[PDB]
Design a protein around this ligand. Structure first.
Ligand SMILES: Nc1ncnc2c1ncn2[C@@H]1O[C@H](COP(=O)(O)OP(=O)(O)OP(=O)(O)O)[C@@H](O)[C@H]1O
Ligand SMILES: [Mg+2]
Lengths: 114, 258, 222, 97, 321
DNA sequence: AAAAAAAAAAAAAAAAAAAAAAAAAA
DNA sequence: TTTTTTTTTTTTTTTTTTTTTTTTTT
């Protein structure tokens, strides 16, 4: 019943281990990030904005679900719709289009990859 | 004093299984009981008819019409009279043993404690009913209790014999369950040697005529077939009511049937 | 509002004896302190968070007696793996019978009983007030690090991880190394630098810290 | 056994077998029952009395009650090719009563 | 004198009666001078008839049973003083026996919540009370003799010792001498012990006739005036009192030499003992040597004391007798 | 001014016994 | 799987005493 499930993996890789240790030590070494803009943007998007769905989302969503059914339960499509409509709330809009559904399906299939 | 009653596991004693699998009381509690009675039903017809008549007389009213008479004449006393006798005896007398009573009790303790060793060595498992020093003190107490009845100031061999017999009836009988067969590690070779010896004995001795334990030992052991446990094999064959009979003070072994 | 012992010792040491028998209710607090060091308070309508920065010194008792040729250290004690991972250092002191050591131990113990004074030796007992004075003065000191020193730490950590990938064996070692091990390496180098040195930390300080950690790790067999 | 709210002394309170003195106690689904609860009626079924020794109270009550019980066989259904002892879980001490 | 055998346990009880010398050490510490004995054995082995004797012969003794005791009943209980009105503390079994002995029977049948408290008293010899605004430390310096039974009805030699005893290891480490006693069937032993028991059961108090019940009532005459060789019990009591109050022996080097060699020999051997050997065995040797030195009415610990202590502990741990 | 009557003042609490649930295992 | 194990949860106040100090009441 969880909408997204992520698996975090830790493999012994020389590149990854060195890169992690490098920035950890750099943080310990003493020498584009908004502070509170996120809270206000989140409140604005959550309290005023309500997107809708158009047939452009219909055409992509139905065929994407069918292609995923070429063991995807019906929960999967209602998960794609929620993610697409949440992406539509971002990059402030008032309606969904192809970009939002593409991002949603990419996210939910990268989740499947793990 | 403690008087206790209980049932075994599974309800009935189930003489087919081991005594250790039938009594759930540990050795710690069972050593504090002077007398233990294991009660079983034998399902005999004569006893069943006697008990049925006795019980029907109770229900039909014929009980009282008899009992008063005996309570009148010389054979029974009322509850109150027996209560007063008990309190008088307990508040008046406290007997003591005699030198010969101690000698007779020590030998009985040695005998009943030796027997347990042979039983435990044969069954290669510890006894569920234990025999300890408390079992000697119990027999001493029973002897003095028997002496107390007659208001006697000394306990003698007459009371010692009855106390010993009561102990044999109560606790030694429970300890000596004598399992016919448990199919355990003990007598493991006997699981086949019993049938082997039975066949060898029934082919040697036809349905008539007799033999002796002396010969059945010497000749059947010269071939090194002795097991030291053939004492009860003859009795087990006797239990079949056909294979073996013992006569003439146990010397003569008679073949009686198939 | 009554604070606990964990809260009571701020910038101090909490000595938890018989940690095996202590209940999961306290295990929750032990888990949370090592994570954030800020104790959340009871639900009696106050909603209070209290500072609890403290260091932990735990003494353990292995399950059912002594060390067991059971290979897993997790089998020796009840403590979860996650709880043990947060600990900076683990020390196993197993009692192995050796004919030489017993003689000196018995002599040392019996000298104290014959004469109440401890056995005189070339070793000099430093005066305890000097102990406290030096410890406090070291605590007040604030080290600092350099970019060159921490570069060798990366090589040390990658060597340790490349060992740990094959270090997974039947008996020795506890799981695999984690970035928390790298963090604890620097954390232990802090104290060894504060001990006598100041300003930038020496390179040999990291070697000393690594040696102490490695001896503690090798204590699993011993 | 309960503590009296007023007197504050341990006292005895009734039960199902005592509420049905000179009556009938009915026990549906008598085989789907704990053994410790089932064994409590052994004294009441035959001796028609209840004995309590708890918290300084040593008393004997009276329960002249009749029991009609209903049960299900093992497997939910009766095998007519088997004897009774292998169609039920109850032992002899409770079957005799 | 009414117990047949158990010579080594009777020696251990005597060494308990004359305790060791307590050493007060820096950091606010004290090395305990009490000897604690545990007896595990088979049913009907005269374990409970020695605790009763210790109750009578000792100067101070408190009796306890496992199942009929509680933690608040052993350490202390918060009560009220009716006459004046304050709230106060009432002593329990352990603290009432300060400089005395506590005899516990059915020790294994005690509940776990009950068994933790006795642990602390066995370790620190002090009780901590922090209830109802009464924050106090109470002194309890008592010697513990205990009797228990194995997990099964009887001791099993085919199973490891820890399986036979249900007690935890932490509790078991706090006893100086653990005696495992077993009843073995042998005809000569039975003939001797039965004779002894039958001789005991034929004793008549002076002034009583045969068959006369004992009148243990005194007829309300409470008092008349209101204020091989064996020794009589009051003389033994005087001896124990005099030894405890008049001699304080000190350890010597030549005894230490024997103690260290015994400890080193015992530690490094493959014999399977009924209890593990640890660094606290040396303290047990020292305490037993001090007690034996007190028995001799001497102010120094000699080699013979070390030999006797070594023999006693070898019998206890190994049974090599 | 001198009698008879009528309330305040409580406080206190741990320590043990019995019964029903919600987690552990031969 | 049915056995043992385990926490745990209200259980509490109904009573006291004679002074000492207040209001009514002839
Ligand atoms: N060696 C002995 N000498 C004399 N009497 C003995 C001896 N051993 C046992 N007894 C007798 O056995 C009886 C029971 O002994 P006791 O009560 O001391 O046993 P126990 O070890 O406490 O038993 P339990 O395990 O049942 O608690 C007493 O009458 C006691 O006199
Ligand atoms: Mg006893």
């Amino acid at each position: 019943r969880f909408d997204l499930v992520y698996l975090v993996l830790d493999k012994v890789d020389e590149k990854n281990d060195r890169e992690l240790a490098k920035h950890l030590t750099n943080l310990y070494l003493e020498d584009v990030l908004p502070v509170e803009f996120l809270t206000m943007y989140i409140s604005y998007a959550k309290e005023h904005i309500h997107p809708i769905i158009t047939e452009a989302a219909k055409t992509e969503l139905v065929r994407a679900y069918v292609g995923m059914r070429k063991t995807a339960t019906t929960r999967q499509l209602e998960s794609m719709i929620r993610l697409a409509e949440a992406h539509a709330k971002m990059k402030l809009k008032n309606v969904v289009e192809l970009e939002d559904v593409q991002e949603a399906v990419r996210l939910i299939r990268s989740a499947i990859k793990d | 004093s403690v008087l206790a009653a209980a049932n075994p596991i599974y309800g009935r004693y189930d003489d087919l299984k081991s005594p250790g699998d039938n009594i759930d009381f540990q050795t710690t509690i069972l050593s504090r009981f002077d007398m233990i009675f294991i009660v079983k039903d034998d399902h005999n017809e004569e006893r069943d008819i006697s008990i049925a008549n006795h019980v029907i007389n109770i229900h039909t009213g014929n009980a009282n019409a008899m009992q008063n008479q005996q309570e009148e004449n010389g054979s029974e006393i009322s509850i109150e009279k027996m209560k007063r006798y008990i309190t008088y005896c307990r508040l008046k007398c406290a007997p003591r043993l005699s030198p010969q009573a101690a000698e007779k009790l020590s030998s009985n303790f040695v005998t009943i404690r030796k027997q347990l060793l042979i039983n435990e060595l044969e069954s290669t498992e510890r006894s569920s009913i234990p025999i300890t020093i408390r079992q000697l003190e119990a027999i001493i107490r029973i002897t003095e209790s028997l002496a107390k009845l007659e208001l006697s100031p000394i306990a003698q061999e007459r009371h010692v014999d009855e106390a010993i017999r009561l102990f044999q009836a109560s606790t030694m009988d429970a300890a000596s369950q004598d399992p016919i067969g448990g199919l355990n590690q003990a007598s493991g070779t006997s699981l086949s040697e019993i049938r082997r010896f039975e066949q060898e004995l029934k082919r040697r001795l036809p349905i008539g005529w007799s033999t002796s334990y002396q010969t059945l030992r010497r000749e059947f052991v010269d071939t090194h077939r002795f097991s030291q446990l053939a004492l009860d094999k003859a009795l087990y064959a006797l239990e079949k009511h056909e294979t073996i009979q013992l006569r003439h003070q146990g010397q003569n072994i008679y073949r009686s049937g198939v | 509002l009554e604070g606990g012992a964990l809260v009571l010792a701020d910038n101090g040491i909490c000595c938890i004896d018989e940690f095996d028998k202590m209940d999961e209710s306290d295990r929750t607090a032990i888990h949370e302190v090592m994570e954030q060091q800020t104790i959340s308070i009871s639900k009696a309508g106050i909603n209070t968070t209290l500072n609890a920065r403290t260091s932990i010194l735990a003494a353990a008792n292995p399950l059912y007696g002594r060390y067991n040729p059971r290979l897993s250290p997790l089998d020796n004690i009840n403590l979860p793996a996650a709880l043990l991972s947060r600990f900076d250092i683990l020390f196993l002191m197993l009692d192995i019978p050796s004919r030489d050591d017993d003689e000196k131990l018995a002599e040392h113990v019996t000298y104290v009983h014959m004469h109440n004074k401890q056995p005189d030796l070339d070793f000099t007992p430093v005066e305890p007030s000097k102990m406290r004075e030096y410890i406090a003065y070291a605590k007040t000191k604030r080290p600092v690090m350099s970019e060159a020193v921490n570069d060798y730490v990366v090589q040390a950590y990658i060597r340790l991880r490349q060992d740990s990938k094959r270090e997974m064996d039947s008996k020795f070692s506890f799981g695999q190394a984690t970035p928390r091990t790298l963090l604890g390496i620097i954390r232990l180098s802090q104290a060894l630098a504060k001990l006598r040195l100041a300003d930038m930390v020496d390179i040999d300080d990291v070697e000393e810290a690594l040696r102490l950690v490695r001896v503690s790790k090798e204590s699993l067999y011993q | 056994v309960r503590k009296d709210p007023i007197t504050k002394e341990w006292t005895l309170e009734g039960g199902a077998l005592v509420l049905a003195d000179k009556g009938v106690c009915l026990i549906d689904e008598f085989d789907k029952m704990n053994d410790q609860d089932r064994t409590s009626i052994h004294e009441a079924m035959e001796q028609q009395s209840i004995s309590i020794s708890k918290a300084g109270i040593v008393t004997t009550l009276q329960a002249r009650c009749s029991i009609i019980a209903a049960a299900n066989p093992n497997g939910g259904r009766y095998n007519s090719t088997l004897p009774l002892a292998q169609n039920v879980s109850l032992t002899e001490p409770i079957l005799s009563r | 004198p009414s117990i047949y055998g158990h010579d080594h346990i009777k020696k251990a009880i005597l060494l308990m009666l004359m305790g060791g010398v307590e050493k007060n050490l820096e950091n606010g510490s004290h090395l305990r001078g009490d000897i604690n004995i545990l007896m595990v054995g088979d049913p009907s082995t005269a374990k409970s008839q020695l605790l009763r004797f210790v109750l009578n012969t000792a100067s101070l003794a408190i009796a306890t049973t496992g199942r009929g005791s509680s933690g608040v009943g052993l350490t202390a209980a918060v009560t009220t003083d009716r006459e004046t009105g304050e709230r106060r503390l009432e002593a329990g079994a352990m603290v009432l026996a300060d400089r005395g002995v506590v005899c516990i029977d059915e020790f294994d049948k005690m509940t776990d919540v009950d068994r933790v408290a006795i642990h602390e008293v066995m370790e620190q010899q002090t009780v901590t009370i922090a209830k109802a605004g009464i924050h106090t430390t109470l002194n309890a310096r008592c010697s513990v003799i205990a009797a228990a039974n194995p997990v099964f009805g009887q001791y099993d030699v085919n199973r490891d010792p820890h399986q036979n005893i249900a007690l935890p290891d932490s509790l078991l480490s706090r006893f100086d001498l653990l005696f495992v006693v077993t009843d073995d069937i042998n005809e000569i032993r039975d003939r001797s012990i039965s004779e002894h028991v039958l001789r005991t059961h034929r004793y008549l108090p002076p002034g009583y006739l045969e068959g006369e019940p004992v009148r243990e009532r005194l007829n309300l005459s409470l008092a008349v005036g209101e204020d091989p060789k064996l020794v009589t019990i009051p003389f033994l009591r005087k001896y124990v009192q005099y030894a405890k109050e008049r001699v304080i022996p000190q350890l010597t080097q030549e005894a230490i030499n024997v103690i260290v060699k015994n400890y080193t020999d015992l530690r490094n051997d493959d014999n399977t003992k009924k209890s593990p050997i640890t660094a606290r065995t040396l303290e047990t040797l020292i305490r037993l040597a001090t007690a034996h030195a007190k028995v001799r009415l001497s102010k120094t610990v000699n080699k013979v004391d070390a030999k006797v202590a070594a023999n006693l502990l070898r019998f206890a741990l190994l049974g090599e007798d």
